[PDB]
Design a protein around this ligand. Structure first.
Ligand code: CLA
Ligand code: CLA
Ligand code: CLA
Ligand code: CLA
Ligand code: CLA
Ligand code: CLA
Ligand code: CLA
Ligand code: CLA
Ligand SMILES: CCCCCCCCCCCCCCCC(=O)OC[C@H](COP(=O)(O)OC[C@@H](O)CO)OC(=O)CCCCCCCCCCCCCCC
Ligand SMILES: CCCCCCCCCCCCO[C@H]1O[C@H](CO)[C@@H](O[C@H]2O[C@H](CO)[C@@H](O)[C@H](O)[C@H]2O)[C@H](O)[C@H]1O
Ligand SMILES: CC1=C(C/C=C(\C)CCC[C@H](C)CCC[C@H](C)CCCC(C)C)C(=O)c2ccccc2C1=O
Lengths: 73, 40, 144, 80, 124, 165, 742
């Protein structure tokens, strides 16, 4: 998110990381993208654009929101 | 002959003649007036 | 007419056997026994598959469910004009008799029977489902 | 166990009793019809729900009705 | 009665089955569990080692395959245990009882893992 | 023109489309003889193609950017700009025939309901009666309206069976 | 000892149109006329169910015999049309001169509504639809060289069609054979073995020896067709025949003096394919039909009719009695002489299996000239005769179950082979059930294993030739054994029967006619798919036959009949228990299994056999991608269905544009069928009630009460549309593809 907010036009958002022991090495390399540490999925739900529009700018902004909603749950 | 003409009056026989006639009329019209798209 | 008593030693038809017979249910829950008298030796069709020869005189068969016994009863009555009767037998040794319940086949009206599950109304006079709601269980308007 | 009900439009034709493949129904005396007999359902615990009785009833609408209910070894028609 | 057949009713076949651990009555359920567990556990290692994902590694293939065979024996032991819990909640053989089956499942785990370990020692 | 369309007679894409179709036909032509059977058939096709493109332009149709005729369905726009022959006039052409067929069939169905065995008059058609009703259907719109005003077109609500409610 | 003799009845029935005007006359139920629309469907459904109209076997047999004359008369009209259209609307004469460059065509369309574009450029200064029926190759092999010869056959075909319809009328209304006549099975086999097959083979050998061989010998030499001697000149002038085949100079003396080696020049045993035409040697084909003629004529003298010598079929059956099977084949003779359905069940089974064997042998041993290099004809013929065989086999199950319900009588069957089979049906179905589950996992699971390993980037873990291998070692051994047969086991054969076993390819006109076919891991996997889908189809159909009369669910299923929808929602639900429904389900699985068979054939041929020969070597249509790609489901989707459907979807605007339209239309009919399969008539009867109300409101309600289709007719309408749509989709896809590239 913090990298995407800088250049949203030319960066694919990341949904979450992948830890699949069944993967082979070509699969691990194939899904590594976006400057991530390892394999990741690209987000398609638009939460990046939504959260960026409503004023979120850093990962700590998302962390505080996550703990707040877990408490509300 | 009365029974034979009764057989020709059965639904499948009538439909075959009727649609054969109906199709022939439409086919012939398009043979002499090819490509009708607008009444004009 | 009195309730017949089953005779476990009654001879059985001449049948080789099949894979369509009794299962473990007969040893744990129940099974059914059908008996009848045969005027002459004849070939009939087993509801479990195959053909069997009925001995002259008493015959006895064991089946896994009631419908199988009453399927053979229909064949014996309609074609061979016999009068079979069958029981329900439990693993504990108890024997329950049925069909004919009172000795007369149900198709024929008999005095002494008490009507059961008879509604003195038409189907169109049942109440609406809303009026039998929250009655403790799923209940149709026909039940009340 | 299924539920089987006989309604007062029965004409006592006996066709439901003959059709039943499990001897669930029987005929009893009655005074509400010309035949002076009515169908009865004393042994519904053996009913399997085939609805052969409803197929055989001449009256309109039916005079015998089967409402499928709780299942069991007998009503599910199992031999195992 | 049931359709007689040599496979269903033969002398040679009957004697062979009567000597198997499952049908050999008079033996404590735990001991039968160990005897059955050892046989299956020993075989269970074969396919994992030869056709596993790490089969082509020289030395890791033996370890990885056997370690996966040990895991499957553990899962099977759980299946045996819960089966006894569901089946026996309230007869001739002690095995078919709540007490007997629980001992049987425990023996299978001990025998099965021993068989998997014994199979590994054979390789190295 | 209408909705940004242009007359096909003035459309560049429309003209180019005709050349493409004629070019395809000409390419196949040059592999035959001058007056062989295949050549004559191909020439006949080309004549119909040229006639078709002249007729549509002469009809004053509208072509889009695709260079294909588009039809106008609004009665106001059609009568305003002389496109009544595309959809508006054919609308009343079809309804006359559709009502003709339906009215003739309804007359026959009523006619045989009075017979002793109506069912046998439906699988086995009474051809003399059907031809009689076929010709009298030309005036169905007049007959149809008069039935409506006299109240004999529709059944009474009390004579129609309905399910419990 | 009832003598074998002709027995008929005079004027059994009167020829009148009275009953033509009374629909339903044949059945007591339908004779009263319609009250609901259900009557109309019942009229057509039961029209040919003779066994249910009357209980008299003699009356049933007479209808069957004449209904067969009507079928023969229809085939002659159809055959006559094919020969006539070859004479008047085809480019056959041009094709004879340049067979390798001119596409066969025998259908021409009229110039209306712009459909004349379907008259494509096929060659020979002719425009028409290209045909894949292979009639041009058949006519050339027989020696036809002019449209006059085609025209005369068509006229003869119509005369035969008229004779067939006269025979049907004569043998039903004038002189109808009695029941005792129909039951001479020994006599019928004698005439049909030595008379129909035997003399038919000998007569055709006469045509080949005297017409086909001389004409095709000159055609292959390059002689202009118009300059070849006419077939009657070859017959009348032994001098001409001697020039082509010197053996004719000796007449028929060698035949009667047993110097049969004199005829070695036209009665050959070469084997292989003719290099010039790419088809089997006609001299080999003539010796085949001469050998087959003698074998069948001997076969026709086996059964005893009127003169003591011979076999009694009843005695043979009763003598074959073993320790494991109780009474044995006792009672089968009475079953097979009193049940038409039992006879039909056997004949459909083997006739269908034969049609499938024809498909395999004709492609591997192309019997006609220029058949092999015409890839459209090879693909069409193989696919056509596989579908015919598939439907016939499913019918064999249908009519085996009809026999079990109607014609089966326990009194005649006690402890015989038939009875004992019924008495362990649970053992049979339970074992066949497990085999199908085993075959499904270990064949289709391998494809799922490969698809997952490939998607995970683990190609080394796949089942393939470059990975874990599954070689058809048994099939490969047989291919090599047949390749070396001429050396030691068939010394007098010059070449192997087929070029599929091995050796060198034969190329005609720059295209491969046949070459060795290699079996690898993909072939191993696909073959075990065939075994899986065939075994499942047996399970469904065999289950229906064995449980037609009763089961543990419906103990009295026979009384319900052969074709009923259910026995109600009781016992949990009994939908589709009747034996008719096992045919209904079996049709889907037969369609599923044969679809893979014709996809296997189509991809394997294009990838590994068909192609263009050039200086460097053979380039195949799909470039040998079967071996590496057909081991995953994704490979079939991408490389076969998606790539090869390019031709059909680009067909618009060309002569093949018709196949594009039918490709879409077939997709439509298939999806339309799911409406009938996924729904039930309860919804539709209520829908019609509201529709009927609108008609009642307008005094336009019909006298024949509308009814939703029955439960069974919904299933029949569903499967018929499902099959038509699915099969037509492949049909369009195959022809538009192979015609475009092949
Ligand atoms: C919604 C359905 C629909 C409609 C509205 C049309 C409409 C038309 N189609 Mg199309 N068509 C359809 C479905 C339809 N089609 C389908 C399903 C197919 C596939 C089989 C085709 C295949 C097709 C072809 C191949 C052709 C057409 C053509 C035509 C034209 C025919 C004009 C004519 O015959 O005048 C004739 C004049 C009449 C007056 C006919 C009625 C006669 C009665 C007696 C008049 C009585 C008056 C009182 C017209 C524009 C033709 C064309 O040129 O289109 C541009 C043409 O060649 N259609
Ligand atoms: C199916 C519905 C429908 C719709 C959405 C339209 C839409 C249109 N019609 Mg059409 N029209 C229809 C059915 C319809 N019409 C029918 C059934 C008839 C009778 C056979 C007509 C007769 C008709 C005429 C005579 C005219 C239009 C016109 C129009 C346009 C503007 C006025 C209008 O109708 O506003 C929206 C539509 C409605 C609310 C439905 C009723 C419309 C009535 C019948 C016509 C109104 C005309 C209007 C008073 C003209 C004022 C001058 C205008 C330049 C502003 C518009 C494109 C006018 C036009 O050509 O404008 C360029 C015009 O002169 N229509
Ligand atoms: C191969 C096709 C074929 C054949 C050989 C037959 C043969 C027969 N049909 Mg069948 N039929 C067929 C297809 C066929 N049908 C199909 C596709 C249907 C639609 C589902 C029907 C529907 C049908 C009905 C409804 C009836 C028959 C009847 C008959 C019988 C008498 C026919 C007769 O006298 O014709 C005489 C033929 C000629 C004089 C030839 C010239 C005239 C024709 C019309 C051309 C005969 C056994 C009738 C019967 O009695 O069945 C027991 C009968 O009522 N058929
Ligand atoms: C299996 C049988 C069969 C089939 C499917 C066809 C099919 C066809 N024939 Mg052929 N035909 C056949 C047998 C058959 N024929 C036989 C046995 C003869 C010998 C009498 C002929 C003689 C014949 C002639 C003389 C002609 C055709 C033509 C046709 C075409 C148009 C038919 C049409 O609409 O007529 C009109 C429809 C009705 C009268 C109804 C069509 C492709 C025509 C054709 O291809 O023209 C280019 C044509 O001219 N056929
Ligand atoms: C003109 C001559 C003639 C006449 C008047 C009759 C009259 C009669 N026949 Mg006879 N019959 C004839 C010729 C004739 N037959 C011939 C040529 C044959 C040999 C096939 C037979 C074989 C025959 C049999 C086996 C039986 C009769 C029976 C009958 C009776 C009823 C027939 C009926 O309802 O037909 C009406 C039926 C039709 C009009 C259907 C015609 C079917 C033909 C074969 C055409 C098939 C076309 C095919 C489906 C095309 C494909 C369709 C696709 C394109 C959609 C009646 C006494 C029946 C009887 O006596 O029952 C008690 C009976 O069982 N006939
Ligand atoms: C059924 C198949 C068949 C038929 C019909 C023929 C027919 C023929 N073959 Mg062939 N042939 C066949 C199979 C057949 N062959 C096979 C399988 C082989 C391989 C072994 C051969 C090998 C072969 C050779 C090597 C030769 C022939 C030849 C012939 C011709 C003369 C035979 C001869 O001398 O007959 C002798 C006599 C008879 C057959 C008897 C004729 C009886 C007549 C028809 C009786 C008429 C009676 C009547 C009342 C009179 C009319 C009265 C009326 C006008 C009023 C003849 C056209 C010869 C030939 O000429 O080839 C070009 C020849 O050399 N064939
Ligand atoms: C030699 C072949 C043969 C023969 C002689 C018979 C004969 C018979 N079969 Mg059998 N059958 C066969 C093959 C054969 N079958 C095959 C191959 C199958 C597998 C599909 C079956 C499956 C089968 C079933 C499931 C049943 C029969 C039944 C019957 C009996 C009544 C048939 C009837 O009334 O049809 C009347 C004919 C029709 C209603 C016409 C059917 C039209 C089809 C569905 C059209 C399909 C599309 C078309 C071919 C192409 C497109 C058309 C175009 C217009 C779009 C009769 C004894 C029935 C019976 O009761 O037997 C005791 C029965 O239930 N057969
Ligand atoms: C793609 C669709 C599909 C599939 C997968 C199946 C599957 C099956 N059908 Mg069915 N069927 C279908 C469509 C399908 N059918 C349709 C459309 C119809 C209507 C005409 C029918 C009608 C029908 C009938 C009438 C019969 C079958 C039968 C069968 C079975 C064949 C034998 C077997 O067990 O194979 C093995 C099973 C498979 C190949 C299924 C897929 C297995 C995967 C690839 C591997 C296992 C997964 C693995 C354990 C991982 C799971 C992880 C997860 C738990 C987290 C099987 C369960 C026959 C049967 O029951 O035979 C015993 C049978 O009689 N089918
Ligand atoms: C093989 C089995 C042959 C068996 C064989 O030839 O048996 C021979 C034996 C014949 O015994 P009889 O000598 O008594 O038979 C006299 C005959 O004339 C028939 O009356 O048949 C049976 O016992 C029938 C039941 C066999 C049950 C077989 C069960 C296993 C089936 C396996 C199917 C595999 C299919 C593979 C296809 C390639
Ligand atoms: C069942 C049996 C069916 C048999 C049908 C036979 C039909 C025969 C038709 C052809 C007649 O011709 C058959 O006899 C003629 C007379 O010997 C032979 O004629 C040959 O020998 C003649 C001897 O004088 C010469 O004059 C001829 O030039 C020469 O061709 C033909 O080579 C032979 O093919
Ligand atoms: C659609 C559908 C129907 C409704 C379909 C019906 C009633 C068949 C309709 C057939 C035709 C279209 C109606 C009869 C047409 C007449 C012969 C008149 C035609 C006159 C000219 C136009 C030719 C069922 O009855 C049904 C039953 C069981 C399972 C599924 C279904 C199902 O899916």
């Amino acid at each position: 998110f913090e990298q995407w907010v800088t250049d949203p036009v030319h960066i694919r958002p990341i949904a979450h990381a992948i830890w699949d022991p069944h993967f082979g090495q070509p699969a691990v390399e194939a899904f590594t993208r976006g400057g991530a540490s390892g394999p990741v999925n690209i987000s398609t739900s638009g939460v990046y654009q939504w959260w960026y529009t409503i004023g979120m700018r850093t990962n700590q902004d998302l962390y505080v929101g996550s703990v707040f909603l877990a408490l509300v749950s | 002959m009365k029974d034979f003409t009764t057989y020709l009056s059965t639904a499948p026989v009538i439909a075959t003649i009727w649609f054969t006639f109906t199709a022939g009329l439409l086919i012939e019209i398009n043979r002499y007036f090819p490509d009708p798209l607008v009444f004009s | 007419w009195t309730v017949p008593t089953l005779n476990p030693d009654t001879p059985s038809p001449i049948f080789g056997g099949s894979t369509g017979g009794l299962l473990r249910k007969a040893q744990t829950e129940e099974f059914y026994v059908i008996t009848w008298e045969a005027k002459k030796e004849q070939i009939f069709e087993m509801p479990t598959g195959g053909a069997a020869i009925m001995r002259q005189g008493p015959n006895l068969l064991k089946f896994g469910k009631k419908e199988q016994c009453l399927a053979l009863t229909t064949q014996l009555r309609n074609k061979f004009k016999l009068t079979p009767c069958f029981y329900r037998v439990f693993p504990d040794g108890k024997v329950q008799y049925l069909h004919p319940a009172d000795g007369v086949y149900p198709e024929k009206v008999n005095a002494g029977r008490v009507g059961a599950n008879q509604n003195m109304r038409r189907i169109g006079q049942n109440v609406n489902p809303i009026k039998v709601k929250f009655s403790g269980r799923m209940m149709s308007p026909a039940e009340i | 166990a299924h539920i089987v009900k006989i309604y007062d439009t029965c004409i006592g034709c006996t066709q439901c009793v003959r059709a039943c493949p499990l001897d669930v129904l029987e005929m009893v005396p009655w005074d509400g019809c010309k035949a002076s007999q009515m169908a009865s359902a004393p042994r519904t615990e053996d009913c399997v729900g085939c609805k052969r009785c409803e197929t055989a009833c001449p009256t309109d609408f039916l005079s015998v009705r089967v409402y499928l209910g709780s299942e069991s070894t007998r009503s599910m028609g199992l031999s195992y | 009665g049931m359709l007689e057949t040599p496979v269903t009713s033969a002398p040679i076949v009957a004697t062979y089955l009567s000597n198997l651990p499952a049908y050999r009555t008079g033996v404590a359920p735990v001991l039968r569990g160990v005897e059955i567990g050892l046989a299956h556990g020993f075989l269970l290692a074969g396919p994992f080692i030869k056709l596993g994902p790490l089969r082509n590694v020289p030395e890791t293939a033996e370890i990885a395959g056997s370690l996966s065979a040990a895991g499957l024996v553990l899962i099977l032991a759980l299946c045996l245990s819960i089966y006894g819990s569901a089946q026996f909640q309230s007869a001739r053989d002690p095995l078919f009882s709540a007490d007997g089956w629980s001992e049987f499942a425990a023996g299978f785990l001990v025998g099965g893992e021993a068989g998997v370990a014994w199979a590994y020692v054979c390789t190295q | 023109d209408i909705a940004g369309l242009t007359p096909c007679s003035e459309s560049k894409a429309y003209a180019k489309l005709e050349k493409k179709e004629l070019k395809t036909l000409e390419k196949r032509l040059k592999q035959y003889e001058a007056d062989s059977a295949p050549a004559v058939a191909l020439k006949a096709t080309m004549e119909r193609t040229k006639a078709r493109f002249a007729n549509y332009a002469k009809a004053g149709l509208l072509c889009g950017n695709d260079g294909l005729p588009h039809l106008i369905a609004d009665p106001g726009l059609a009568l305003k700009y002389g496109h009544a022959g595309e959809v508006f006039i054919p609308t009343f052409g079809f309804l006359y025939v559709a009502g003709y067929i339906g009215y003739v069939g309804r007359q026959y169905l009523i006619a045989v309901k009075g017979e002793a065995k109506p069912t046998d008059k439906e699988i086995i058609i009474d051809v003399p009666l059907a031809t009689k009703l076929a010709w009298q259907g030309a005036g169905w719109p007049l007959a149809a309206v008069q039935e409506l005003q006299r109240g004999t077109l529709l059944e009474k609500e009390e004579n129609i069976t309905v399910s419990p409610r | 000892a009832k003598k074998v003799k002709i027995a008929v009845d005079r004027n059994p029935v009167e020829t009148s149109f009275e009953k033509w005007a009374k629909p339903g006359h044949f059945s007591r139920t339908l004779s009263k006329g319609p009250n609901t629309t259900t009557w109309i469907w019942n009229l057509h459904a039961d029209a040919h169910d003779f066994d249910s109209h009357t209980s008299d076997l003699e009356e049933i047999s007479r209808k069957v015999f004449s209904a067969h004359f009507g079928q023969l008369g229809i085939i002659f009209i159809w055959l006559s049309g094919m020969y006539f259209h070859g004479a008047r609307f085809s480019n056959y004469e041009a094709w004879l001169s340049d067979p390798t460059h001119i596409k066969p065509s025998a259908q021409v369309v009229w110039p209306i509504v712009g459909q004349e574009i379907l008259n494509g450029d096929v060659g020979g200064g002719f425009q028409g639809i290209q045909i894949t029926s292979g009639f041009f190759q058949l006519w050339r092999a027989s020696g036809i060289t002019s449209e006059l010869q085609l025209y005369t056959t068509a006229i003869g075909g119509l005369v035969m069609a008229a004779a067939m319809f006269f025979a049907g009328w004569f043998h039903y209304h004038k002189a109808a054979p009695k029941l005792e006549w129909f039951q001479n099975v020994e006599s019928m086999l004698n005439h049909h073995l030595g008379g129909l097959l035997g003399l038919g083979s000998l007569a055709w050998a006469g045509h080949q020896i005297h017409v086909s061989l001389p004409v095709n010998k000159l055609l292959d030499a390059g002689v202009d067709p118009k300059e070849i001697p006419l077939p009657h000149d070859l017959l009348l002038n032994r001098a001409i025949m001697a020039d082509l085949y010197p053996s004719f100079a000796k007449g028929i003396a060698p035949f009667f003096t047993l110097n049969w080696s004199e005829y070695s020049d036209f009665l050959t045993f070469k084997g292989g394919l003719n290099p010039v035409t790419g088809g089997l040697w006609l001299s080999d084909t003539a010796h085949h039909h001469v050998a087959i003629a003698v074998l069948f004529l001997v076969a026709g003298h086996m059964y005893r009719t009127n003169w003591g010598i011979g076999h009694s079929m009843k005695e043979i059956l009763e003598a074959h009695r073993g320790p494991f099977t109780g009474e044995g084949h006792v009672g089968l003779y009475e079953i097979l002489t009193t049940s038409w359905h039992a006879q039909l069940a056997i004949n459909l089974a083997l006739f269908g299996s034969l049609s499938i064997i024809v498909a395999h042998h004709m492609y591997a041993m192309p019997p006609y000239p220029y058949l092999a290099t015409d890839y459209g004809t090879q693909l069409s013929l193989f696919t056509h005769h596989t579908w015919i065989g598939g439907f016939c086999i499913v019918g064999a199950g249908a009519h085996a179950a009809i026999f079990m319900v109607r014609d089966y009588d326990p009194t005649n069957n006690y402890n015989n082979l038939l009875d004992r089979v019924i008495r362990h049906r649970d053992a049979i179905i339970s074992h066949l059930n497990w085999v199908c589950i085993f075959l499904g996992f270990h064949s289709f699971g391998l494809y799922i294993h490969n698809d997952t390993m490939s998607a995970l980037g683990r190609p080394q873990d796949m089942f393939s030739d470059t990975a874990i291998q599954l070689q058809p070692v048994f099939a490969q051994w047989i291919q090599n054994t047949h390749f070396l047969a001429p050396q030691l086991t068939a010394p007098n054969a010059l070449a192997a029967t087929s070029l599929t076993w091995g050796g060198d390819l034969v190329a005609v006109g720059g295209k491969v006619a046949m070459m060795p076919i290699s079996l690898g891991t993909s072939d191993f996997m696909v073959h075990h798919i065939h075994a899986f889908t065939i075994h499942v189809t047996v399970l469904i159909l065999l289950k229906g036959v064995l449980f037609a009369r009763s089961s543990r669910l419906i103990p009295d299923k026979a009384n319900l009949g052969f074709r009923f929808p259910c026995d109600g929602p009781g016992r949990g639900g009994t939908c589709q228990v009747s034996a008719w429904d096992h045919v209904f389900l079996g049709l889907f699985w037969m369609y599923n299994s044969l679809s893979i068979v014709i996809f296997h054939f189509s991809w394997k041929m294009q990838s590994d056999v068909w192609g263009t020969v050039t200086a460097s070597g053979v380039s195949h249509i799909t470039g040998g991608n079967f071996a590496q790609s057909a081991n995953t489901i994704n490979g079939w989707l991408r490389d076969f269905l998606w790539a090869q459907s390019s031709q059909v979807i680009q067909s618009y605007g060309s002569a093949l544009s018709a196949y594009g339209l039918i490709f879409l239309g077939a997709h439509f009919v298939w999806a339309f069928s799911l409406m009938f399969l996924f729904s039930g008539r309860g919804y539709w009867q209520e829908l019609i009630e509201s529709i009927v109300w609108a008609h009642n409101k307008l005094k336009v309600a019909p006298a024949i009460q509308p009814r939703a289709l029955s439960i069974t007719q919904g299933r029949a309408v569903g499967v018929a549309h499902y099959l038509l749509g699915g099969i037509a989709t492949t049909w369009s896809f195959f022809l538009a593809r192979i015609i475009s590239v092949g």
